[PDB]
Amino acid sequence: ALRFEALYPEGMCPGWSVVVKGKTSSNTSMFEINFLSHPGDQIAFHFNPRFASSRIVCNSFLANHWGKEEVNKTFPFEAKEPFQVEIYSDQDYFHIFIDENKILQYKHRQKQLSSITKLQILNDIEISSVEITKRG
Amino acid sequence: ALRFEALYPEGMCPGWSVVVKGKTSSNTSMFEINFLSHPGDQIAFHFNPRFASSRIVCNSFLANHWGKEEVNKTFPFEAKEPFQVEIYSDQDYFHIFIDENKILQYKHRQKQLSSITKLQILNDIEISSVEITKRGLY
């Protein structure tokens, strides 16, 4: 289910940091953080920690379909343990830092960065804080 | 991927030691050592050092689900450096050591100890030795 959504019509990319703090209830579930663009509610960036396999899956949902998955084996998450995910975008990538260490970068596929106006957080995450801050 | 598996059909629990020597390839991946019960290769005991968070998770898959995870208080391992892990079983626990220093004990949840016939080692460990030894004078 949808746990949190934010809308910033002036565009939250590039140059904004998103910090999500929370914890996941189950050791077999998953959550996701999506950045969506208008028009068409396309998913520019989908970030999906999967606890059953201890993998992070990233992708984009453009032209009504997913593209190639980018799978990361660095998995700094444990069920029921608080975590902090920071996502920052520059001209070329989304950058992910978890518990203050750099984890991965994801090259933009949606180039219309300024049309990325929506943040969505779904599924198994009990959110304690969301911060959205201009840094660029 | 599977790095090593051993099968001792008469049952390697309780009263056996397993010594695993090796090192990780990555600073931020993980490996696991599982003890599997027969029939079905069922996960009686799962030991999972996780280098991204520096946490050890232990659990068992019983009655169709993972049980309560035990997250160890300490994480003595260093990535990309040789280690020696020793695991021994008695009637009550798996006892785990690094360098012969105790890390943790895990109380048996699967009570059919004699059905634990397989040792399986998965994911980010470059193995240099596995020794499986019956403890005399049990």
Side-chain angles (χ1 to χ4, degrees):
Chain A
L2 177 71
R3 311 304 290 266
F4 179 90
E5 178 169 307
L7 178 64
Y8 179 72
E10 286 162 285
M12 63 169 68
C13 190
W16 290 73
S17 56
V18 175
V19 181
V20 179
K21 300 180 192 186
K23 67 185 178 187
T24 292
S25 73
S26 167
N27 53 39
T28 60
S29 195
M30 65 175 68
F31 72 92
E32 62 195 67
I33 302 172
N34 298 321
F35 289 77
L36 296 96
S37 60
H38 67 90
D41 281 303
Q42 304 196 89
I43 305 173
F45 178 51
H46 165 79
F47 171 82
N48 176 211
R50 300 185 179 179
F51 286 67
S53 57
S54 296
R55 293 285 184 278
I56 303 174
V57 176
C58 295
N59 208 334
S60 304
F61 188 79
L62 304 173
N64 256 276
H65 61 81
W66 293 106
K68 188 59 146 60
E69 289 184 342
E70 301 186 22
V71 181
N72 209 292
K73 300 192 184 177
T74 298
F75 197 81
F77 299 103
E78 279 77 23
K80 304 182 181 300
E81 300 287 1
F83 54 74
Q84 177 179 308
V85 178
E86 182 160 5
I87 308 187
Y88 177 74
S89 56
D90 62 26
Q91 306 97 318
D92 301 307
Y93 299 94
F94 285 92
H95 300 277
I96 300 289
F97 270 71
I98 298 172
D99 302 340
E100 295 188 328
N101 301 130
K102 178 68 189 276
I103 306 304
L104 66 88
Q105 60 190 20
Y106 183 90
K107 189 179 169 60
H108 295 307
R109 301 182 190 173
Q110 167 60 282
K111 303 299 186 181
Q112 192 81 281
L113 304 185
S114 304
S115 73
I116 299 172
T117 57
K118 185 176 293 175
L119 173 72
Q120 282 190 325
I121 305 175
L122 314 173
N123 298 326
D124 183 11
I125 177 174
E126 298 165 337
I127 295 169
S128 66
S129 183
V130 182
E131 181 201 343
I132 300 167
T133 302
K134 187 191 296 180
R135 300 296 191 180
Chain B
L2 174 71
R3 310 306 287 267
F4 179 92
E5 188 168 284
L7 167 60
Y8 178 77
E10 285 196 6
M12 58 168 74
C13 190
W16 288 75
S17 289
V18 175
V19 177
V20 177
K21 306 186 184 187
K23 68 185 172 180
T24 74
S25 180
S26 175
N27 285 323
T28 64
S29 191
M30 63 177 68
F31 73 94
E32 62 192 70
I33 302 172
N34 301 315
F35 288 79
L36 310 180
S37 61
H38 186 75
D41 286 6
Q42 303 193 320
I43 305 169
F45 174 48
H46 166 76
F47 169 78
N48 176 213
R50 300 164 70 86
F51 288 77
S53 291
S54 296
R55 292 172 175 147
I56 299 166
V57 166
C58 294
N59 208 346
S60 304
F61 192 92
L62 294 166
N64 305 305
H65 63 281
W66 286 110
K68 301 192 174 183
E69 281 190 352
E70 299 181 23
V71 182
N72 200 58
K73 288 178 188 179
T74 64
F75 190 86
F77 292 98
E78 184 174 14
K80 303 182 160 185
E81 296 290 351
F83 56 74
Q84 307 183 32
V85 172
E86 308 93 7
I87 303 174
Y88 173 73
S89 54
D90 63 24
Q91 291 310 123
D92 294 340
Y93 302 91
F94 287 97
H95 302 273
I96 303 195
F97 305 80
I98 184 171
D99 190 33
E100 315 294 347
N101 277 73
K102 201 159 179 187
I103 304 174
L104 63 88
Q105 60 186 24
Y106 182 90
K107 189 183 304 182
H108 292 306
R109 300 185 191 171
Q110 174 54 264
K111 302 295 167 161
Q112 190 89 299
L113 302 186
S114 49
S115 75
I116 298 175
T117 62
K118 289 178 186 180
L119 173 68
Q120 178 191 70
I121 307 176
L122 310 177
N123 300 320
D124 181 22
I125 178 176
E126 300 180 346
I127 293 166
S128 69
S129 188
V130 181
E131 179 153 15
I132 298 168
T133 302
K134 188 189 302 177
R135 182 158 178 184
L137 323 178
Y138 180 69

